[PDB]
Design a protein around this motif. Structure first.
Motif, PDB file in Angstrom:
ATOM      1  N   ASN A 221      56.810  64.830  57.038  1.00 55.33           N
ATOM      2  CA  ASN A 221      57.016  66.111  56.371  1.00 55.33           C
ATOM      3  C   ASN A 221      56.331  66.131  55.010  1.00 55.33           C
ATOM      4  N   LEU A 225      53.190  68.519  53.753  1.00 54.61           N
ATOM      5  CA  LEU A 225      53.225  69.328  52.539  1.00 54.61           C
ATOM      6  C   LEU A 225      52.070  68.974  51.609  1.00 54.61           C
ATOM      7  N   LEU A 228      48.888  70.426  52.903  1.00 53.54           N
ATOM      8  CA  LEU A 228      48.774  71.851  52.608  1.00 53.54           C
ATOM      9  C   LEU A 228      48.373  72.077  51.158  1.00 53.54           C
ATOM     10  N   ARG A 232      44.970  73.734  49.728  1.00 51.11           N
ATOM     11  CA  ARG A 232      44.991  74.797  48.730  1.00 51.11           C
ATOM     12  C   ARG A 232      44.066  74.463  47.568  1.00 51.11           C
ATOM     13  N   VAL A 235      40.403  74.900  48.767  1.00 51.84           N
ATOM     14  CA  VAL A 235      39.965  76.290  48.786  1.00 51.84           C
ATOM     15  C   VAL A 235      39.823  76.823  47.364  1.00 51.84           C
ATOM     16  N   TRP A 239      36.492  78.345  45.795  1.00 53.54           N
ATOM     17  CA  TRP A 239      36.501  79.582  45.024  1.00 53.54           C
ATOM     18  C   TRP A 239      35.772  79.421  43.696  1.00 53.54           C
ATOM     19  N   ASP A 242      32.205  79.301  44.264  1.00 55.32           N
ATOM     20  CA  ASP A 242      31.754  80.658  44.530  1.00 55.32           C
ATOM     21  C   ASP A 242      31.557  81.419  43.231  1.00 55.32           C
ATOM     22  N   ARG A 274      41.056  94.047  44.096  1.00 53.09           N
ATOM     23  CA  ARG A 274      41.655  94.230  45.412  1.00 53.09           C
ATOM     24  C   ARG A 274      43.006  93.530  45.510  1.00 53.09           C
TER      25      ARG A 274
ATOM     26  N   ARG B  22      34.010  84.473  48.410  1.00 53.73           N
ATOM     27  CA  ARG B  22      34.989  84.424  47.329  1.00 53.73           C
ATOM     28  C   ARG B  22      36.259  85.166  47.708  1.00 53.73           C
ATOM     29  N   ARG B  23      36.107  86.369  48.264  1.00 48.74           N
ATOM     30  CA  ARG B  23      37.289  87.120  48.676  1.00 48.74           C
ATOM     31  C   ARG B  23      38.048  86.390  49.779  1.00 48.74           C
ATOM     32  N   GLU B  24      37.323  85.804  50.735  1.00 46.10           N
ATOM     33  CA  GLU B  24      37.990  85.082  51.812  1.00 46.10           C
ATOM     34  C   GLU B  24      38.746  83.869  51.281  1.00 46.10           C
ATOM     35  N   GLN B  25      38.146  83.137  50.339  1.00 46.87           N
ATOM     36  CA  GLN B  25      38.835  81.999  49.736  1.00 46.87           C
ATOM     37  C   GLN B  25      40.067  82.443  48.961  1.00 46.87           C
ATOM     38  N   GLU B  26      39.987  83.573  48.252  1.00 41.90           N
ATOM     39  CA  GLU B  26      41.167  84.066  47.546  1.00 41.90           C
ATOM     40  C   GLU B  26      42.292  84.389  48.523  1.00 41.90           C
ATOM     41  N   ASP B  27      41.948  85.034  49.639  1.00 45.05           N
ATOM     42  CA  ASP B  27      42.955  85.350  50.648  1.00 45.05           C
ATOM     43  C   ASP B  27      43.554  84.082  51.240  1.00 45.05           C
ATOM     44  N   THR B  28      42.706  83.099  51.544  1.00 44.94           N
ATOM     45  CA  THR B  28      43.189  81.829  52.073  1.00 44.94           C
ATOM     46  C   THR B  28      44.086  81.131  51.062  1.00 44.94           C
ATOM     47  N   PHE B  29      43.739  81.219  49.777  1.00 49.53           N
ATOM     48  CA  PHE B  29      44.569  80.635  48.730  1.00 49.53           C
ATOM     49  C   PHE B  29      45.949  81.269  48.704  1.00 49.53           C
ATOM     50  N   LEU B  32      47.843  80.031  51.765  1.00 50.14           N
ATOM     51  CA  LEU B  32      48.296  78.661  51.566  1.00 50.14           C
ATOM     52  C   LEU B  32      49.452  78.602  50.581  1.00 50.14           C
ATOM     53  N   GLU B  35      52.446  79.631  52.599  1.00 53.06           N
ATOM     54  CA  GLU B  35      52.747  78.601  53.585  1.00 53.06           C
ATOM     55  C   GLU B  35      53.368  77.378  52.927  1.00 53.06           C
ATOM     56  N   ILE B  36      52.850  76.981  51.765  1.00 50.09           N
ATOM     57  CA  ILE B  36      53.420  75.857  51.032  1.00 50.09           C
ATOM     58  C   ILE B  36      54.850  76.166  50.622  1.00 50.09           C
ATOM     59  N   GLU B  40      57.930  73.991  52.004  1.00 51.19           N
ATOM     60  CA  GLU B  40      58.837  73.326  51.076  1.00 51.19           C
ATOM     61  C   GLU B  40      60.277  73.705  51.373  1.00 51.19           C
ATOM     62  N   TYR B  43      61.312  71.904  54.705  1.00 44.61           N
ATOM     63  CA  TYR B  43      61.434  70.453  54.662  1.00 44.61           C
ATOM     64  C   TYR B  43      62.540  69.994  53.724  1.00 44.61           C
TER      65      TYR B  43
END
Ligand SMILES: *C(=O)CSCCNC(=O)CCNC(=O)[C@H](O)C(C)(C)COP(=O)(O)OP(=O)(O)OC[C@H]1O[C@@H](n2cnc3c(N)ncnc32)[C@H](O)[C@@H]1OP(=O)(O)O
Lengths: 274, 46, 96, 80, 106, 113, 270, 9, 93, 92, 106, 94, 87
Positions: A221, A225, A228, A232, A235, A239, A242, A274, B22-29, B32, B35-36, B40, B43
């Motif tokens: 677990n 974590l 993940l 993060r 990414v 960014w 980028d 956005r 850049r926008r895709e990475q921001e969305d993925t961030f 995440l 999800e984190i 947490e 667990y």
DNA sequence: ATCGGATGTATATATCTGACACGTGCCTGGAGACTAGGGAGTAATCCCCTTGGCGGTTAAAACGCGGGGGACAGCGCGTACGTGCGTTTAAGCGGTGCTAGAGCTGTCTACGACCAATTGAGCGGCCTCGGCACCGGGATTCTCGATGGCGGCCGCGTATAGGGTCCCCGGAGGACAGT
DNA sequence: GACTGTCCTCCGGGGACCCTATACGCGGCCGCCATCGAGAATCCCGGTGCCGAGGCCGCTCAATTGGTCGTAGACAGCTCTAGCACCGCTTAAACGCACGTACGCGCTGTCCCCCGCGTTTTAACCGCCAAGGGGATTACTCCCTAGTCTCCAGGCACGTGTCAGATATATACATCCGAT
């Protein structure tokens, strides 16, 4: 008390770099082996051999780090297949006989690091930690080094192995001899007398099921974590790269537009919420 | 010149690509991050 | 009215009698007991006063030591009231 | 003389106990204490009288008591 | 030639001659060494000095200038070694050491 | 093979792990706060440049455009350094947890033999 | 023969059971963080190029603006503590490597630099001492000796003893230098406590406030003339020399250990 | 000195 | 009739140790009894020591051994010191 | 040559139990017992003689010492036996 | 005139002469009365007879014909007066009287 | 499986029925020589002296345990505890 | 640094089973675990006193060997007379 | 309370050893017999101190009545001590070899016993006064129970709030009337 | 008759103040801390008043000296026991561990008994008077015991044989414990 006030001139040569102080107290439990890298260090004989016989005129460069990786792999493989090589050093295995073990060898948790580099999705680059020196990232994979120079290096390392009668090249501390448990000479030290052999467990399955598996699940677990969080951060790194690329391209575009005197269509030169 | 305009178009397309990334990475961030937080909670709380 | 709580007067008496050093038994009854006991060994015995006083001193000291031991035994049984079985235990341990 | 052991009264016994450090006393203590005292006195007086008779005297001296206590391991100071 | 007391020859206050005589008349051995009475007198004087010193300290601690048996009892029973030496001895008019058990206290 | 020895060794090896994990996660947090602050620092300047382009176009140069660009480059570069530090820290923590996990898996496999 | 630890070349004091190959070397190289020994300069260079450790391999439990303290288990860091013991034998004729380093805890004081934390001294400690020793072996590097560092080490040892709610004493076979240093520390602490207390104080209160054993206190009192018998009792004796020494102490303004900077809890051993 | 108790509590 | 005692020597010792302190009669009797007690103990022990080793003379050695047997710890040490010192001084003159 | 009461203990045993034997350790224990009782009685008699400032140990001191040491019926029978023995001896 | 042992003159088994000699050489008094050794020997013989009788009874009660220290211990500790006389004496290989406290029994 | 106490009672009878020594001789001898070191070095011992010491020690310990058992019973318990031994020795005057 | 192995303690040799056997002969039914250590301490004190007196007798005789009679005399001096070794 | 299973313990028997029982030669410790001095028995004495009475004073023992509190029984939980079994250790036995030192013997000197002559320290009797005991008045800080009070959980609504509930609102279509 | 425009009545749905949620305003009480008064704790200061401790003075007698004589004991040499030490095999016993229960221990409720205090009664204490038993003294005088010298047989060391009991083995009986 006898004097100790003599200063060394090559301190600045041997001691370089910078250590950053942390705001909170240092938290650390890793061993010395974790923060040193390859356990083998070349001596003057090894560097002369590498420079004059391997790197004198080679178009493919074998680095000292790669030399120590090869010598460490040979050492580990020899101690694995021939733990009693010192009993008969002249019967040391050949390079080809030892090569399959070198292929299946897991030196410095390489397989674990590669698995992690796969899991982070960071296998584009390599898995690097604070315990690893920056210079050792560039070294080629071990298998490549074996295929290109393994026999050539192994013959010399085998000769030096035989010279030291199957023992270690690095001079070792004197060890307790089982024949007598008390050795008059001071040299013998750091012996068994501070280990306490335990009672063996013939019939213990329960503990393994109850607590070992549960703690393994908790470790899984935590690993998930941390994976993940590491993704993060990966990414976030993508960014920020980028952002750097966008800034450089935007300034180049603006300079090129001003050189060509092109008006409008400036939306890509600015940010949009956005 | 048409050479500098060709470089201009190449840089325009590459910058459009980096803007999209850049926008895709921001969305993925952001994904995440959520999800984190959920992991947490699972667990450690659950 | 005013009354002291049980045990306060006891502690006051303990301090008082541990502070003083006079004999706590009445002279004449003790002497009569001594002569009564001595009649059973020989008739018409005479006693020096100092002999009776020494007997009283030895008796009181012996009893005081016995009471200290009895108190230790009573405390050992998680009690504060000395009982006859405490005295019997103490004398038994001594060897009496 | 008979039953002079009742001369050793309840207040005297509890006084001895107080000097001994006793705080609370059961009522049954007193008779036991009287018995113990009688035993002790008999044991000492017997030896005292034996010393007196060996010296062929009809008067018990303090030294006889001292020698008896010495014989019983209860040496006493302050009488010679 | 004038005589000098054996106590003065040994620098002692206790009577060496009396001790020697008591040894001879005490039916202890056929013969008595010359130095034995000196040694014994010295030891007795030392022990007397120790007890008298402790008793004097106790008497001062009680604002008294005359030593009484109570002071002797306090001095003896407060010294571990002297108490062990006199564990089977009773001091007349000596009293008892003030000692109250904790559990009896409120 | 001693299951109880394996359990004891695993617990001892993992005894200091949560404290180091907290230390690393909070160091990543501090670096991410530095990153957020530097992000504000260079986002304000990029907002100035972007608003300038919005109102007057891209052809006219801002009177301090080269200095603003250099400052943005500086802030972005130290943001990159901060993110590199966070990534390395997370990589070390994941290394430790996965190393302990694999060692436990190896010991479990040996005890299963 | 002679050893080069970091920038300081040192001249050894006593035999140490190093590999005989190093007794056959003119120069011995010692890592300033891992304490590894080298007879080969090339191996030293390669190790330095690959050695990433820049602080004691353990948790930092104390740090001031000058030095920091690290707690290291001998069992967990076996090679490193073996290196430390091997180096320590060179400067005490009496050290015993007849036993390995497992049951010993090592509290190491370092000074921080750009290169990292530089060890200046340490003191070891048995995990389970029968004699109640709060220090087993204390070695301070000769290139840092006579600088007050050993005083700070003893201060930290007694600070741990206070944090353990225990009194502690060094291993009684003290060396002449160690005996003198402890004489100085005990005298300074006792004088400071006596003067600052300004009141009659019980021996047990001194031992509780300083974690010094009462035996040490009494022996120091016999070496000094602090306790005097005057008017049927022993009493605090405020003579001139005591206050003069206390004034020289106040004038020297030596470094002191700050307890509030110690973030540490006693280890639990099964 | 001749007497005991060179140092006690 | 003359009945001897140790009173005067106890008084001299008291004057040497506490020159401003007096003593009651009862306490002087107690001290005299104590001295007689210690004397009897030591002499008896010395007699047994002489008998065990089949000797017919009580010397200083027997007294010293008896003192070591009867006195605890530092009391014994100091008593032996005093005895040896006094015997030496007596042997000197 | 080391002397002991062995032969006399053996005669007494043969008087009281003709068909019973005794181990050597038991004989040693009996010998130690005899020596102990001897020393106690002799010491008490010596103290009695000293307290009365006499320099001769007569049978009367022995009798008083026996009365002091032996409890009750033991003392009575010991006194009887000693008196009978002394009487018979004095008439021979 | 032939000699007759003083034991025979007193009708005793214990050696009167040896007792008299031990008294003279025991440093007890300047002079020794004529009848004192006789009295002492008689008392010692009586006590020996008492103990040997009790030990013989115990040995018969254990189906043994040879007295061992265990029998001596049983005989002594079972006699109230002998036990009081030997309350401070330890008999080697004597053992202990069988005695189980009631409260420990089921 | 016998209930707790049955085996203890059987041992009590067995050891109150015999007279042999219950301590192994050699450890006791080593302890004696160790204690003897602290007064004079290179002391020699007769075997009978060691046996007498062992006899006296075992008798003293047995008597102490009897007193301790009496103290434990007095407190209405059946398990002896260190406090019971301390009380026994205190009352004995040790 | 451990200097001398003279600190070895033979008091341990007095094993738990031996102490249980002694208690059983003494009539003890149930035993706390701390009893064994308390017993070892008591035995150590007793032996120290007896041995000290025995050695004092031996030194007085100017002999290097401790005899049984010395032990007997020491016990006598402690009021613990012992029968079965002499005297 | 009755019964069978399993373990310990007492009982009958047979064998084998060494310790107990007995014999002998020897010497030294005990028995005879004798003397001389003095310890101890005896008589007679003196007067101390032990015993035994009276009678007044009053402290202390004895008696009685609460009632608080500690001894005591019950009871419910859990740890730790006993039991059993398999593994491991060294105690025990025996056997060998060495030498420190216990034990003995023969010297011969120094020291202690002894006695007579000497004398001053120490004992008994005799003062003398102040340390200590008693008889008052006086007297702060130390315990103990008591209840007054600042401020916290909870009675117990109340002001606001997601929303059951239906008479009216919006424009768009149908019927009488008008352009 | 057809078409443009205005009034009024009916489908579709916004809504308005709502049924008893919801959360705290605003205290009861209550709860423990905050003082806070009453007794009390023996102690303390100062006369004062005597009798025990301490100092003096003869007068012995016990301590000192100065010899002498005899032997206990200090010392040197010598024998040989026995205490120590090491080797090696057997196995009884110690040790470790796992298991379950029964004992210790804490806690709650009951009650009777011992403390505290007030009142009555005894008899201990003290001061005094008086007799005479017996402890202590002295002076005499006997006979008992130490000391001697001789004599010889009881008791010791030291060998010698055999049977009581330790040991082993096979067995019946007593005792514990689970089951009904
Ligand atoms: C056993 O119990 C384990 S403890 C011993 C372990 N080994 C060991 O210590 C040996 C190697 N280490 C040292 O000895 C080391 O120097 C220490 C540990 C003693 C520390 O010494 P420092 O020198 O670092 O200590 P400081 O706090 O600086 O105080 C030094 C004091 O010593 C005096 N000194 C030193 N050398 C001296 C010489 N040669 N001559 C005179 N005085 C000397 C200093 O003056 C100073 O005295 P202070 O009164 O100023 O303290």
């Amino acid at each position: 008390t006898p004097d100790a006030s003599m200063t060394w001139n090559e301190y600045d040569k041997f001691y370089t770099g910078s250590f950053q102080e942390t705001t909170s107290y240092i938290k650390f439990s890793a061993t010395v082996e974790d923060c040193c890298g390859t356990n083998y260090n070349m001596d003057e004989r090894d560097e002369t051999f590498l420079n004059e016989q391997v790197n004198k005129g080679s178009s493919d460069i074998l680095t000292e780090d790669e030399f120590e990786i090869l010598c460490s792999s040979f050492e580990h493989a020899i101690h694995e297949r021939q733990p009693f090589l010192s009993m008969d050093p002249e019967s040391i295995l050949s390079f080809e006989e030892l090569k399959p073990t070198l292929i299946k060898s897991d030196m410095a948790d390489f397989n674990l690091r590669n698995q992690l580099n796969h899991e982070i999705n960071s296998h584009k680059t390599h898995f690097i930690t604070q315990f690893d020196p920056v210079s050792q990232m560039n070294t080629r994979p071990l298998i490549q080094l074996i295929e290109k120079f393994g026999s050539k290096i192994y013959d010399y390392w085998r000769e030096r192995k035989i010279e030291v009668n199957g023992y270690e090249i690095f001079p070792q501390l004197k060890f307790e001899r089982p024949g007598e448990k008390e050795e008059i000479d001071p040299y013998v030290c750091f012996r068994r007398r501070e280990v306490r052999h335990p009672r063996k467990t013939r019939r213990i399955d329960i503990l393994n099921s109850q607590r070992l598996r549960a703690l393994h699940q908790e470790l899984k677990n935590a690993k998930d974590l941390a994976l993940l969080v590491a993704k993060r951060e990966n990414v976030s790194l993508n960014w920020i790269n980028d952002e750097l690329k966008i800034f450089d391209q935007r300034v180049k575009i603006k300079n090129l537009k001003r050189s060509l005197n092109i008006s409008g269509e400036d939306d890509d030169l600015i940010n949009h919420k956005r | 010149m048409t050479d500098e305009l060709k470089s201009y178009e190449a840089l325009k397309a590459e910058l459009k690509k980096s803007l999209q990334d850049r926008r895709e990475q921001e969305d993925t961030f952001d994904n995440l991050q959520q999800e984190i937080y959920d992991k947490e909670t699972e667990y450690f709380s659950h | 009215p005013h009354r002291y709580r049980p045990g306060t007067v006891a502690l006051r008496e303990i301090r008082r009698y541990q502070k003083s050093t006079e004999l706590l038994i009445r002279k004449l009854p003790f002497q009569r007991l001594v002569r009564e006991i001595a009649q059973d060994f020989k008739t018409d015995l005479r006693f020096q006063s100092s002999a009776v006083m020494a007997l009283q001193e030895a008796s009181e000291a012996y009893l005081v030591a016995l009471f200290e031991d009895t108190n230790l035994c009573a405390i050992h049984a998680k009690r504060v009231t000395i009982m006859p079985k405490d005295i019997q235990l103490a004398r038994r341990i001594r060897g009496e | 003389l008979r039953d002079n052991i009742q001369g050793i009264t309840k207040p005297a016994i509890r006084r001895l106990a107080r000097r001994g450090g006793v705080k609370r006393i059961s009522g049954l203590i007193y008779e036991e204490t009287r018995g113990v005292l009688k035993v002790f006195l008999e044991n000492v007086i017997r030896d005292a009288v034996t010393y007196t008779e060996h010296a062929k005297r009809k008067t018990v001296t303090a030294m006889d008591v001292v020698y008896a206590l010495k014989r019983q391991g209860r040496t006493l100071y302050g009488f010679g | 030639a004038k005589a000098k007391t054996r106590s003065s020859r040994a620098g002692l206050q206790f009577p060496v001659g009396r001790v020697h005589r008591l040894l001879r008349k005490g039916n202890y051995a056929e013969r008595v060494g010359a130095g034995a009475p000196v040694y014994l007198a010295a030891v007795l004087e030392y022990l007397t000095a120790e007890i008298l010193e402790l008793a004097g300290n106790a008497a001062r601690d009680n604002k008294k200038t005359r030593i009484i048996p109570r002071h002797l009892q306090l001095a003896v029973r407060n010294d571990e070694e002297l108490n062990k030496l006199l564990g089977r001895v009773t001091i007349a008019q000596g009293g008892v050491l003030p000692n109250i058990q904790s559990v009896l206290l409120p | 093979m001693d299951p109880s020895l394996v359990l004891e060794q695993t617990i001892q090896d993992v005894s200091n792990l949560p404290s180091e994990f907290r230390y690393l996660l909070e160091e990543i947090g501090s670096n991410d706060l530095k990153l957020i602050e530097e992000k504000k620092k260079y986002e304000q300047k990029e907002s100035q440049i972007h608003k300038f382009i919005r109102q007057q176009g891209s052809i006219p140069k801002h009177p301090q455009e080269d200095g603003l660009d250099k400052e943005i480059k500086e802030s972005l570069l130290k943001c990159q350094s901060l993110q590199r530090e966070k990534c390395v820290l997370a990589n070390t923590a994941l290394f430790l947890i996965a190393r302990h996990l694999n060692k436990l898996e190896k010991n479990i496999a040996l005890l299963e033999e | 023969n002679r050893i080069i630890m970091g920038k300081y070349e040192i001249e050894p004091w006593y035999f140490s059971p190093y590999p005989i190959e190093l007794t056959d070397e003119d120069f011995i190289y010692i890592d300033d963080f891992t304490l590894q020994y080298f007879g080969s300069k090339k191996q030293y260079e390669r190790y330095r190029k690959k050695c990433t450790l820049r602080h004691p391999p353990g948790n930092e439990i104390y740090r001031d603006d000058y030095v920091s303290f690290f707690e290291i288990d001998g069992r967990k860091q076996r090679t490193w503590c073996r290196n430390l013991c091997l180096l320590s034998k060179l400067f005490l004729d009496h050290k015993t490597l007849y036993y390995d380093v497992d049951p010993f805890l090592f509290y190491c004081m370092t000074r921080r630099d750009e290169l990292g934390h530089h060890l200046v001294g340490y003191f070891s400690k048995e995990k389970e001492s029968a004699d109640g020793y709060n220090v087993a072996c204390i070695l301070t590097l000769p290139q840092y000796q006579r600088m007050g560092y050993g005083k700070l080490l003893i201060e930290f040892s007694y600070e741990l003893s206070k944090k353990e709610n225990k009194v502690g004493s060094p291993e009684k076979p003290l060396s002449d230098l160690g005996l003198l240093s402890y004489r100085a520390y005990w005298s300074d602490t006792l004088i400071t406590l006596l003067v600052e207390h300004q009141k009659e104080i019980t021996i047990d209160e001194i031992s509780s406030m300083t974690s010094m054993t009462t035996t040490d206190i009494l022996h120091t009192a016999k070496t000094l003339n602090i306790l005097r018998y005057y008017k049927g009792q022993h009493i605090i004796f405020l003579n001139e020399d005591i206050l003069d020494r206390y004034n020289r102490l106040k004038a020297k303004k030596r470094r002191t250990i700050d307890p509030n900077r110690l973030i540490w809890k006693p280890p639990v051993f099964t | 000195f001749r007497h005991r108790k060179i140092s006690v509590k | 009739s003359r009945k001897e005692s140790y009173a005067i020597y106890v008084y001299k010792v008291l004057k040497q140790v506490h020159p401003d302190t007096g003593i009651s009669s009862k306490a002087m009797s107690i001290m005299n009894s104590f001295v007689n007690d210690v004397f009897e103990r030591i002499a008896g022990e010395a007699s047994r020591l002489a008998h065990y080793n089949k000797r017919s003379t009580i010397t200083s050695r027997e007294i010293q051994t008896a003192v070591r047997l009867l006195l605890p710890g530092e009391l014994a040490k100091h008593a032996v010191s005093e005895g040896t010192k006094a015997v030496t001084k007596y042997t000197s003159a």
